[PDB]
Amino acid sequence: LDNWFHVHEMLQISTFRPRTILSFPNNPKSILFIDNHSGKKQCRISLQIDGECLKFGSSDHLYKILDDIDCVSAAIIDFTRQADHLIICAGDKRLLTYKILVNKDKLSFDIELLHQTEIISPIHAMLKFKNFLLTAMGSTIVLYGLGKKQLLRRSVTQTPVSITKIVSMHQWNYERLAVGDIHESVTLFIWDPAGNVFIPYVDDSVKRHVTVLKFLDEATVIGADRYGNAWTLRSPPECEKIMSNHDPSELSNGAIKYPLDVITLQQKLPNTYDCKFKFQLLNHFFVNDIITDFHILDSLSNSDRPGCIYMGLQGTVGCFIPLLSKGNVFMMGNIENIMAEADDTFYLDYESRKKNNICEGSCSILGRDHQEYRSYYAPVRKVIDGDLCENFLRLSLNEQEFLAKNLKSVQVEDIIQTINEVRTNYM
Amino acid sequence: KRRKTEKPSLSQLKSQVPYPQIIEWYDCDARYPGLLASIKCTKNVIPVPSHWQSKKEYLSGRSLLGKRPFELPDIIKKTNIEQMRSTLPALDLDYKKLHDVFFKIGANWKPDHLLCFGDVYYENRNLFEETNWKRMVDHKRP
Amino acid sequence: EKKERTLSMLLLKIKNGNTASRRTSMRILTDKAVTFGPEMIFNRLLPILLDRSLEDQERHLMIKTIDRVLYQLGDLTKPYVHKILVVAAPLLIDEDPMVRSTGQEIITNLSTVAGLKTILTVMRPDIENEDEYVRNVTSRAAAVVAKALGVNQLLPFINAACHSRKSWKARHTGIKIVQQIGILLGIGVLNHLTGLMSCIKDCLMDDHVPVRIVTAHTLSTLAENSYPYGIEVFNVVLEPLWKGIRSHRGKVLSSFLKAVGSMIPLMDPEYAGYYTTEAMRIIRREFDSPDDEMKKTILLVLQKCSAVESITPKFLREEIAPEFFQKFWVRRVALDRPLNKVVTYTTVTLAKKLGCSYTIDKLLTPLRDEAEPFRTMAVHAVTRTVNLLGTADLDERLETRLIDALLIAFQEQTNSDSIIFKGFGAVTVSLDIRMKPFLAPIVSTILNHLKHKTPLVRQHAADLCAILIPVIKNCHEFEMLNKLNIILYESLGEVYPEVLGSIINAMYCITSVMDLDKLQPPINQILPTLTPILRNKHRKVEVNTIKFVGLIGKLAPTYAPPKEWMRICFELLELLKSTNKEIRRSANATFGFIAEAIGPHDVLVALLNNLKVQERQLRVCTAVAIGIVAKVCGPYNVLPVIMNEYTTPETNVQNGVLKAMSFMFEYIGNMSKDYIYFITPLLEDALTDRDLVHRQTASNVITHLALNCSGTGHEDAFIHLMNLLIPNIFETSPHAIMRILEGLEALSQALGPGLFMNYIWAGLFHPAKNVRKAFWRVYNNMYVMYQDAMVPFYPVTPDNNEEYIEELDLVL
Amino acid sequence: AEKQRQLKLQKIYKQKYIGLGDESTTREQWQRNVRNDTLNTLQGHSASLEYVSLSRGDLSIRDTRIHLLKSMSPGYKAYLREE
Amino acid sequence: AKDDELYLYHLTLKKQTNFVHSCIGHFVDLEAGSKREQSQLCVATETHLELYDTADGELKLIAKFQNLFATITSMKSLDLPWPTFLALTSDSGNLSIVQIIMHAGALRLKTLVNQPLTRTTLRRVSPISYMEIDPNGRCIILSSVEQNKLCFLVDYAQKLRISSPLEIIRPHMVTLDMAVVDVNFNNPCFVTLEIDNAATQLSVHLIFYVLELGLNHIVKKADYLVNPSANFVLSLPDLSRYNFNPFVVIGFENHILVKDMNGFFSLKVEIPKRSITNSRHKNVTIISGIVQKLKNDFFVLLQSNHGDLFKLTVSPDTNDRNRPLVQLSYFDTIQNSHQLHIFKNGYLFALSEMNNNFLFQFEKLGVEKNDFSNVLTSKDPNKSLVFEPSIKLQNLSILSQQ
Amino acid sequence: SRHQFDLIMCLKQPGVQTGLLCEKCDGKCPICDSYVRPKRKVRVCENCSFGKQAKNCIICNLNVGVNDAFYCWECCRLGKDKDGCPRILNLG
RNA sequence: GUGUAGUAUCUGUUCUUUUCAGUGUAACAACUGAAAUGACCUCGAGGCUC
RNA sequence: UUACUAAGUCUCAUGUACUACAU
């Protein structure tokens, strides 16, 4: 319960501080690493597949050095199914294209510089769109194709006025996008072929600073905050009906019939409702770390319930498991409610026995309530925190049986059963 | 005096604004108009309800005279206490019945209207007609 | 500088006047004492508090003023040292602890004002006071001056001025000041323990017996202050303390025993046995004390030795049990209150070490004796031993002897001896399952004590029966139930309220132990008989009757006609807000079972009909009854009928509904989460209503509802509820404004700041000078509850403000 | 009476919690509170502090922390200018 | 209709690894019937908390304690004249003094007294984020980054007793780097660097405070204005052999100062610099100082942003007079470490804010004060020494890494 | 207080001491005067304790209290629990 | 089924020195100060009028 | 085919509730 992992890795300090990590779409797991130099701008690229790394060409070195290239952001792309290119964005504001080679029983990685392209923005975020590079300028989203001697702008989409910069963004099956901001929050776009443009169809409710963002689904989005909020949003069914029943080409121009309220919100509140829909908050949570990477895994160690696991910056990995049925979240919710004020229950018992004849923060060891701490920035909505219910396992049998008496429901033993059920069955 | 006459024109203020149509004539006397335009015109902010500058204490409404006293949510109206106790100008009930109405029958139940992110209720407004409206856009089709 | 005299009148302004107007005088005098004259200032400040008219608060104010003057006039306080030393000395020896504390504080302030040399030159020549009271006052003054000006700062001067051989006065005053300093400091004698013992050891072998007694008293005080650990310095005089136990005579041996009594528990485990064996030659031999100063000292020393872990229980039973039982365990102290307390405490402390059975089979005579005076102390000691040890060490013959002694003491209770009444319950609890074979003895005892028809006798009998009711009636007999119930309901009209309350408590205990119709009094008869008893205005009588009516409907919820239960509930509904909280708790404890037995619909309809009657002086309690009747199955049985009572057009009724909704929500923390949605269409017409009252109380609903439902995920409903509130922010009046503020603050927790912010922001500044003043209230409360929570939500951009923050745009 | 108490509680809450906009507050006074609280939380959470350290690229993290502390005072801009 | 209402179950699989706080006390006595040894350490990251022992010269997991569900903003152990239990301050403002106990078959963390302070949030008024305890354990002090400072007087009895808080409130003075000076039981004295919040110019001024046990309040003693470049303060224990007058070490960016309480002695010693000075070169600073004293020899270790680990010793300068001198030198350095501890054993625990916490035993102890070559003195405050870093790692020896 | 307006509070940093309330005022959360689900015992600054005034009811300021005052769960979440020292200085 | 003091709320009614300047107000409102007298022209409006 | 807004202040009367206070 404490570890749940093993870490496979004089004084040793490397001058190169790592930057990002990449993986090829076609190869199921082949992981390419990109670092930086602290000093004169310099980079290295180290590819590993299967057990340990790779050699570079016939050279002894297992890594590649790139002089004068620094990487603000980088992503790998395959323009054709048989060719693999790498993408660097220099702080010089220059877009650098590369080519990856696997030698295969001579096996080695061979990187090859292709083109040079000047960029207006720093390019904080980019990803793979179909056949294309989908990149975000500071203001605007450019979709680059593959040209020769350099890469070309296939399409450009001007952002709504609200978006200053794009920290991160993600796609859903090439049809949809969710675009994040520094200041403002996620805004979802749809690619319209023959319109050659992404159309925003939904805004977000509040201001949230989004570091990393993913899709669980078509209609829902995961996002984290610079300040440590882990949230998930969902497009309203009023919007899902419209986009399910209509083609994207009619959104920007053409006839789409919106209920009376939406338009009245357009003339009444043009600033908020400019995107004509709003994300109803679906899940909200606070993890005191800053989440670096979300990943949605269809199964965790063959488990049925697909989870989403995140690694935080200060370091952590945690998961959000969707609970099937209800009485799962009913029992879990009741256990969390128990452990929440459990310190207060101990204090009131210890108080009554003093009336007939241990401080208040005894069981929590600290004054913070659970709902208060986990609420913090914004109240947790549907998320029940299992990290609390896990503390019920360590308490002595006297304390546990003292707590579970508040329930007409099952005994402490079945409680512990349901608690320990999550790590076993759900992953 | 001089500060009151020092004020820039509201149209001079519009240019600083990405969404100029929200700014209004009274924003000229905003002590910090360039700032207040940025805040008021910021993305998700919801402008102050306009019943200020009226002295009517926010409800003089003639429409308030004609508002219905109340209507039970139909799920609760199923409980039949409406007939058991006459509120308009004893009824033994079952615990299982009432409990199931709130939980078994009414767990998924939610009020039909509610309101949205920036919905603000002005005096003359009445939600009920808009509820029958939204429900009607639903039922009736060409 | 005559205006300083008017400053004394300003001191009256500090005494007679307002709190701020009084503190302003001190704040001004703090910056003016240096320019007022030390002589006249002292001559006007000291007699002001020296007069007997210095009240408690007046004394505190005068002490604070003198402390401020000393802090301002530091060197100027030197010439006035002869004044305060003559004034603060008696006040430090006052009776009340507050007076002595104020005197010690004043002495410490005067000492810290000047230097230690001034205090030395002041307290040194004051030893010429031949009066014992004056000498003790001077010694206490020197001790207080040393406790604040540094113990080692005055230690060498005192040791050099007291180590001489002038006369017995200085030799006694040295030990007196040492003991006073050790008592005033307390636990701060650890480092200065040996430093003081080095100067106090000169009296352990002193020639004069008075100096030896003073040294012994000082050593005992130091050992008590530095106890229990740290007996290293005690070894410096441990040898004389262990030797002179059987060496001195009269006062010397008494002082030696008094010091050894404190030094024994602080001693180690090895030398403790030797010290006890050396002191027993003069302790056990002189156990019979001609006076009280020797007897109390010997009792305290025996208690301290029993507390020590050195002398095991075997040595106590061998050499301590027979002497303690012969010279101490007897009825020879049937009238000495101090002795009756000391011997009882020593016996209770030693019983845990020597075994309860060793004394339970040896104290069954003092209680059964005809002497009620010593019998009271014997019963008190027996009850203390039974409560300390319990019931393990209880022999069959010993248990029989104890039962016989207790019965004889209870029967021969010629006086008002509550010791036997308190010990009977303890003995019955110690009996446990053995009380069943001893049933008829206690049964006949209670019958003879109940049928006596004496007021105090009947009260004591009812108390003892209620104490030992669950032990006897719950023994699975089914034979004494009728004999108890026939006599219980007999004396139902006792004029004495205490006897009536005792009878009610006994009947409640019987109904808790007995069942229906196992109880002797019929339910259909006890109910109508107890009905008018609840109408009485007696505090204890009504408090017992409420619990009796509640327990009547415990196992058997029926035993009644529905009309009778409804009438009882309507009568008890007015007592749900009594002055005594016990009655308020008992009413709620009984009404729950009453409503569970009667029925949900009937009780709900009765409470709803009762809303219009009983105008708003006690009406709200009825609402609490609605909220108290909706706690057995939750608020899903009360709420629908409430909503109809809101459908009623009457204003006052709608108000009572909304408030009843507030309270029923604050009483349920986790329940309202499922009920929130059914509320919002009701608050729809509430918050929209024209009446500032309905808007007020509806906001009060949103307070509790939002606080306890926050974080459940209903924010979308909370968003609605707020959207109706925002327009009410500008509403004036104190009640409306504070209810709405609290409501919005509750919404801050359920929504989170971000949206609640968004409103506050778009209204945050504004030109209107009114709108601004209004919203900055909400933003003040928001800034109070949340700050970091609002940090991400500030709508601040580089074009919005000049400096902005360069670090918010950083992306990695 | 009631409003008059709200004035005193305004003085007390303003004393404890520093900046609380009362009625008229200059944008310089209030924005300073904004900057101070934002920096306060950036340096206050070891999390966001670790974050700004890397994204800024400083040699040590306490450089970023004490940077924010220094950045709280207005004159620190001119101070950087004088380096 | 099916309610979407996604129900997520949060789990922390691996717990936050950036260790922000540490304490040196001896908490639990385990596996030994009677043993008392000061060698042990408890380290905390916000929520997560861990307790390590060494005693072998190699660090050991003891127990990973239950999740506290708060943000621990400071943690410091306290030692009173007994089992050493750690004082812990976090969000909620509560000062929570906790003792690690052995309950049932595991080690559980018991709380003794939690004192309500400020409100529940991470705040500037909140008297947290700066905390230290009297090295004799007589009093604990919390402060705020800006508004106010509170100091409790801690007393032990049959039950622990926390004295009423001692308040000092300076409205516009932003506090940074609380450092408490040890005392002989004379009086507790703590030192801070106050930067004024509202001013026309940037002014960073050190301030001394002596809490008076006699008058029971904190007293502002010496307010010394230093350049805005100031970084941190460290406490020089005595200087009893040389000439109550505490001396502090103020780390600046490109040089070090030490200052007297009475302002008699202010010594500037320029901090040396690397040979390479690769690319962007800051004026640097020293992030973490620490003090150690044995056999009349007390040296302090102060590490720069580059990780360069330095020492200071004091010399009387027998030629002139008996007066303090300040002598820098060079060590094995290390990677940047947030905080440093030293056991009574020769083991030096380096807690790195960067990645990994690792423990040492020092043998060479560094160069002797006699060498004028590589050592700098307070003789001439204006001087510069360039040095090439040493990867040979002579002075310090890594024992355990985490 | 929540109801009577002219009542003034203390609002200092609370000490270790616990405020007392009389049996007459028993059960009220000293801020909101609520009877429901109390949580944490009130703590007052040392300046409100000292001598005889320590024994007074922190609510009604007159009677001598036996019982300790607790904050409710609504004030403990609203944070008014930690606001400062509750006491009523003026009788009202 | 009464009297003393006092309050709130409808409705009816009506438009207070023509102007200037200041305070005030979101702008009003409101408040604070003073005062033109005479001549002429076109359809209450208007005057680089005297 | 009419593209949706009127009462306010003062004065002197009428309409209706109410609050302390006394038989």
Author numbering:
A (entry chain P): 882 to 890, 918 to 1265, 1292 to 1361
B (entry chain Q): 125 to 213, 239 to 291
C (entry chain O): 160 to 971
D (entry chain Z): 2 to 84
E (entry chain P): 53 to 133, 144 to 305, 323 to 481
F (entry chain S): 2 to 93
Give the article text.
Here, by deleting the branch-site adenosine (BS-A) or mutating the branch-site sequence of an actin pre-mRNA, we stall the assembly of spliceosomes in extracts from the yeast Saccharomyces cerevisiae directly before the A complex is formed. We then determine the three-dimensional structure of this newly identified assembly intermediate by cryo-electron microscopy. Our structure indicates that the U2–BS helix has formed in this pre-A complex, but is not yet clamped by the HEAT domain of the Hsh155 protein (Hsh155HEAT), which exhibits an open conformation. Thus, Prp5 proofreads the branch site indirectly, hindering spliceosome assembly if branch-site mutations prevent the remodelling of Hsh155HEAT.
Further classification and multibody refinement improved the resolution of the stable U1 snRNP region and adjacent U2 5′ region to 4.1 Å and 8.3 Å, respectively. Stem–loop (SL) IIa of U2 snRNA is bound by Hsh155, Cus1 and Prp9 in the ΔBS-A complex, in a similar manner to that seen in the human 17S U2 snRNP and subsequently formed spliceosomal complexes. An extended helical density element is located directly upstream of SLIIa. This element is longer than the U2 branchpoint-interacting stem-loop (BSL), which is found in the isolated U2 snRNP and sequesters U2 nucleotides that base pair with the branch site. A modelled, extended U2–BS helix—lacking a bulged BS-A and comprising 13 base pairs—fits well into this density element, indicating that an extended U2–BS helix has formed. In the ΔBS-A complex, the U2–BS helix is located further away from the carboxy (C)-terminal HEAT repeats of Hsh155HEAT compared with its position in the A to Bact complexes, and it is not sequestered by Hsh155HEAT. We find here that, in the yeast pre-A complex, Cus2 (human TAT–SF1) has dissociated and the Prp5RecA domains are located between the U2 3′-region and the U2–BS helix. Compared with their position in 17S U2 snRNP, the Prp5RecA domains in the pre-A complex are located further away from Hsh155HEAT, with RecA1 fitting well into the niche formed by the amino (N)-terminal region of Prp9 (Prp9NTR), with which it interacts, and the U2–BS helix. Moreover, Prp5RecA1 now contacts the U2 snRNA strand that connects SLIIa and the U2–BS helix.
